[PDB]
Design a protein around this nucleic acid. Structure first.
Ligand SMILES: [Mg+2]
Ligand SMILES: [Mg+2]
Ligand SMILES: [Mg+2]
Ligand SMILES: [Mg+2]
Ligand SMILES: [Mg+2]
Ligand SMILES: [Mg+2]
Ligand SMILES: [Mg+2]
Ligand SMILES: [Mg+2]
Ligand SMILES: [Mg+2]
Ligand SMILES: [Mg+2]
Ligand SMILES: [Mg+2]
Ligand SMILES: [Mg+2]
Ligand SMILES: [Mg+2]
Ligand SMILES: [Mg+2]
Ligand SMILES: [Mg+2]
Ligand SMILES: [Mg+2]
Ligand SMILES: [Mg+2]
Ligand SMILES: [Mg+2]
Ligand SMILES: [Mg+2]
Ligand SMILES: [Mg+2]
Ligand SMILES: [Mg+2]
Ligand SMILES: [Mg+2]
Ligand SMILES: [Mg+2]
Ligand SMILES: [Mg+2]
Ligand SMILES: [Mg+2]
Ligand SMILES: [Mg+2]
Ligand SMILES: [Mg+2]
Ligand SMILES: [Mg+2]
Ligand SMILES: [Mg+2]
Ligand SMILES: [Mg+2]
Ligand SMILES: [Mg+2]
Ligand SMILES: [Mg+2]
Ligand SMILES: [Mg+2]
Ligand SMILES: [Mg+2]
Ligand SMILES: [Mg+2]
Ligand SMILES: [Mg+2]
Ligand SMILES: [Mg+2]
Ligand SMILES: [Mg+2]
Ligand SMILES: [Mg+2]
Ligand SMILES: [Mg+2]
Ligand SMILES: [Mg+2]
Ligand SMILES: [Mg+2]
Ligand SMILES: [Mg+2]
Ligand SMILES: [Mg+2]
Ligand SMILES: [Mg+2]
Ligand SMILES: [Mg+2]
Ligand SMILES: [Mg+2]
Ligand SMILES: [Mg+2]
Ligand SMILES: [Mg+2]
Ligand SMILES: [Mg+2]
Ligand SMILES: [Mg+2]
Ligand SMILES: [Mg+2]
Ligand SMILES: [Mg+2]
Ligand SMILES: [Mg+2]
Ligand SMILES: [Mg+2]
Ligand SMILES: [Mg+2]
Ligand SMILES: [Mg+2]
Ligand SMILES: [Mg+2]
Ligand SMILES: [Mg+2]
Ligand SMILES: [Mg+2]
Ligand SMILES: [Mg+2]
Ligand SMILES: [Mg+2]
Ligand SMILES: [Mg+2]
Ligand SMILES: [Zn+2]
Lengths: 95, 62, 68
RNA sequence: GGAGCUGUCAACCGAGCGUGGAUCCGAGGAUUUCCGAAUGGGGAAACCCAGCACGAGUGAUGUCGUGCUACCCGCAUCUGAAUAUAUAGGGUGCGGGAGGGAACGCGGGGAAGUGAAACAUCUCAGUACCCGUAGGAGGAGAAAACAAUUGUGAUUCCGCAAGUAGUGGCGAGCGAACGCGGAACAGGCUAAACCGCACGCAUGGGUAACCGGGUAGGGGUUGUGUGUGCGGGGUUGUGGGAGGAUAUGUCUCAGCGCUACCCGGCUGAGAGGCAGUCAGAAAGUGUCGUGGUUAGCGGAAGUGGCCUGGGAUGGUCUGCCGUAGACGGUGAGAGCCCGGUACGCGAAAACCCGGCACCUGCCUAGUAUCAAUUCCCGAGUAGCAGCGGGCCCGUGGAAUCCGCUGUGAAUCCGCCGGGACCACCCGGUAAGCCUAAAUACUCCUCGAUGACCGAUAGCGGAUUAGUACCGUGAGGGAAUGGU
RNA sequence: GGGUGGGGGAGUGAGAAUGCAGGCAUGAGUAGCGACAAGGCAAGUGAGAACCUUGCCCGCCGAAAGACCAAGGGUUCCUGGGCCAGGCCAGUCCGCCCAGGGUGAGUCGGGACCUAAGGCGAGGCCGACAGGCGUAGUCGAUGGACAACGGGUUGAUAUUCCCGUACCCGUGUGUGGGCGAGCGAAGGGGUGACGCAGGAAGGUAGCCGUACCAGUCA
RNA sequence: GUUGAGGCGAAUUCGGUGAUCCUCUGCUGCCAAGAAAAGCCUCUAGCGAGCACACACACGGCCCGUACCCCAAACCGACA
């Protein structure tokens, strides 16, 4: 019944903006939509054992999509854009 | 007030009937009166609205 | 893991193996996102295992089949 | 259960699982975000913001997890404002309620269009609708009943009685009951009179009592009357208990009503008997069923010849099974190919049902007769008057029943009904409650069925279906099946 | 899947209801193609170009036909594809179709602060029921309070990211010396705190020149 | 200089004019006489053995919106 932060953080965002920020050591994660900056900070800091300078979040509405039975929405998501401390070690994301 | 706080007697519903026998709805309200009732002698009064039937009986005290 | 073979885990290494199941679901999720794992059945399996551990842990403190 | 499987529009892949029993089916549990009666507070429902407690986390604020925190009602306890008694109120702890549901029930409120060829009485119709409120049903129900000279004997429901008696601007219309035939049957619990126990109120000290009755003494004021609680007892209409007398009798033991004797009473326990999950009182634990429901399993008999055909399930010769020739599928009409079918088995557990125990409750002291001197039978009720409602009855001579207003009884040598009323006679016991069955209904689950529909039909909906779309909204609301 | 005959039963016969549904004619290759700003050439792309791309000419708006915010819409934004529907023509284009991507805040606009009108409203009062009203309270901005500027950067965000420089609230750890004051947010009081009209004066932004600077030789 | 992206980068003075902006929640005039609450300040009630203050360092700053359209072809008008 004990909660852990590896379930607040869902997945990394893979995109050209994501890589552009990775270049400057800024990592964008898909996070649980009900989470806030502070638990993202604590969560990243204790998952990857790094010093998080700042977490920036953006709520992103699910794309509405036409299909033969009607219109369906995709998942709504929340990005967390995490910038580490100026000199803290980069996280190893394996790709 | 048309409802007694002791016996719960309420208004009846019937008709006013004219000479032409046109009947329209009206009420027969109970003869509800305000009493300032006490539970024990010299006690604090409590405002009730009770029917004159309960007042005629010993259902309330002053 | 199986419900029977996760019974010999007593009280705390069961939670600790729940922790490593959570961790491996994390990493397997990340390799899903980056496309660097081949067998995608693994996260179904790991999620089921997490559910198994949670279930057994709930029974033990609800009063069923407890013991080291 | 036994070899495939990873649901479906809906193919493609990808990646795997499975006889070490998967997928799948049944049952029980676990998890169960947020909203919603929604209830910590707030809110544009599905969002925001907390407090407390306990944990987690930080260097510490941040942060996370889990519980609890609405209001009202009832019960129990603490406190007891103005103000004293006190109460209102407040604190705490337990319980409960709230909302939803297709129809069916009960109580209450209650139209109009319409019909009357107008229309108001009347009708429509106590319908529609609304309010309250259930339950698996409900309501009713145990005679203040009917009936009429012999009578029936709770209620409900069905068929008659009967479109009758009647009732109606006697118009339009409305419309009983008696009684008969059936379904199903079932009856009970509550005050007093009166009696003990406890509490409160009034009265007296040799006035008197009192200390279970009789016999003697002793104590030497805790009796008597009353209101309130607990019990008994009684619950009836041929009216229904006591209070007395007279006989007759107390299953055993221990304790008690001052003492000794006889008798008797009270409690407890044992023993015996009776009943029970119920309307008549109410809960719990085991054990066992030829039990039933929620999966399922077995289940006969043609590779038959020839013909046509892409295909045989068709034709035609033949062979069989049949407790199975239901139905469906299979490349065209299949009992024999498949699923099955007749039939026969089948349940860990859960739930249901029943039994035995265990348990709980009642009885073990009354009975009979005499006599009718005393008391008892449910109130602001009945009755009466007014105004209404409802009954066939539309107020009429208006009986019975219901509501409000006023007035206002009596307890059986009473009171009510028998269609004004009176007398007689007959019937019944109002103003407390409970009560099975026969009756109503089907959102829903199985199993069947159809001289029902077959895609403009049948549900609005075989298809994104209460969807698209339309409307601010309440609401309205499609079309689209076939290689 | 039918025929015939004995019977049985009908949602049993349509040409009309300004009937209903669907399909399709007639008008008709007709009207119209949505302002009276206005297009053109060269080159390109392409199967296809009046409409797309590029360049250049010409014209139009310029108190908007420009740039923004709120409401509203909802992905229409960007990239890469597409081109039988849509766009009043065509379309290689597109606000269309498809896929992927994209929205970064202590300070901005809101909440976590405040209240107005008004709403709801513990208890409560009233009302046959339903319910009405309302106290405490609690909501409710269109108002009050409250701390950030300039520049850069992406295909798409930027007072949000980055740079430079700030400001506000809170938390912890040290050092120094000082006071054994200090905190007071119940409540009181003050302020908050407010109309309309009209200037004047001092200014500033903006604008027009100009010292100066750099380019051009038609 | 695939004419991307780079690198360098002058001068910036003095006047005029001039606001719908600032001083100004001011001033003047007027009558129709012009929110509230929080906030802030202050008082005391109360709390109080520990405090205030400075500087330095290290930190925490939450939730929602943020794309794009806005005299519109993306809003209300069934329509670009
Ligand atoms: Mg930042
Ligand atoms: Mg944000
Ligand atoms: Mg699309
Ligand atoms: Mg009342
Ligand atoms: Mg009535
Ligand atoms: Mg009428
Ligand atoms: Mg009366
Ligand atoms: Mg299963
Ligand atoms: Mg289950
Ligand atoms: Mg709530
Ligand atoms: Mg609420
Ligand atoms: Mg007092
Ligand atoms: Mg209910
Ligand atoms: Mg009428
Ligand atoms: Mg008429
Ligand atoms: Mg007519
Ligand atoms: Mg009943
Ligand atoms: Mg009969
Ligand atoms: Mg009694
Ligand atoms: Mg079988
Ligand atoms: Mg068989
Ligand atoms: Mg066939
Ligand atoms: Mg068949
Ligand atoms: Mg009367
Ligand atoms: Mg009448
Ligand atoms: Mg009686
Ligand atoms: Mg009775
Ligand atoms: Mg009853
Ligand atoms: Mg019944
Ligand atoms: Mg049935
Ligand atoms: Mg069925
Ligand atoms: Mg249809
Ligand atoms: Mg709409
Ligand atoms: Mg024919
Ligand atoms: Mg025939
Ligand atoms: Mg015929
Ligand atoms: Mg026809
Ligand atoms: Mg026709
Ligand atoms: Mg026609
Ligand atoms: Mg037509
Ligand atoms: Mg013409
Ligand atoms: Mg023309
Ligand atoms: Mg045009
Ligand atoms: Mg050309
Ligand atoms: Mg011009
Ligand atoms: Mg101008
Ligand atoms: Mg675009
Ligand atoms: Mg494009
Ligand atoms: Mg085209
Ligand atoms: Mg076109
Ligand atoms: Mg209330
Ligand atoms: Mg109100
Ligand atoms: Mg208010
Ligand atoms: Mg607010
Ligand atoms: Mg505002
Ligand atoms: Mg932009
Ligand atoms: Mg900075
Ligand atoms: Mg003022
Ligand atoms: Mg000036
Ligand atoms: Mg100037
Ligand atoms: Mg923008
Ligand atoms: Mg439009
Ligand atoms: Mg246009
Ligand atoms: Zn009364």
């Amino acid at each position: 019944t004990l909660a852990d932060p590896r379930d607040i953080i869902l997945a990394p965002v893979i995109s050209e903006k994501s890589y552009g920020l990775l270049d400057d050591n800024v990592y964008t994660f898909l996070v649980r939509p009900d989470s806030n900056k502070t638990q993202i900070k604590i969560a990243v800091e204790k998952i990857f054992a790094v010093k998080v300078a700042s977490v920036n979040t953006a709520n992103r509405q699910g794309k509405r999509k036409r299909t033969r039975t009607g219109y369906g929405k995709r998942k709504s998501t929340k990005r967390a854009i995490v910038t580490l401390a100026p000199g803290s070690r980069p996280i190893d994301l394996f790709g | 007030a048309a409802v007694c706080d002791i016996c719960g007697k309420g208004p009846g519903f019937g008709k006013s009937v004219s000479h032409s026998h046109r009947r329209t709805s009206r009420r027969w309200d109970p003869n509800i009166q305000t009493v300032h009732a006490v539970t024990r002698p010299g006690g604090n009064k409590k405002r009730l609205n009770v029917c004159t039937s309960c007042i005629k009986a010993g259902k309330i005290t002053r | 893991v199986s419900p029977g073979e996760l019974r010999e885990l007593t009280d705390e290494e069961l939670a600790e193996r729940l922790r490593e199941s959570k961790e491996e679901l994390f990493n397997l999720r990340f390799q899903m996102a980056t496309g660097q794992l081949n067998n995608n059945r693994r996260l179904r399996t790991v999620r089921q295992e997490i559910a198994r551990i949670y279930t057994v842990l709930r029974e033990r403190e609800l009063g069923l089949a407890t013991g080291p």
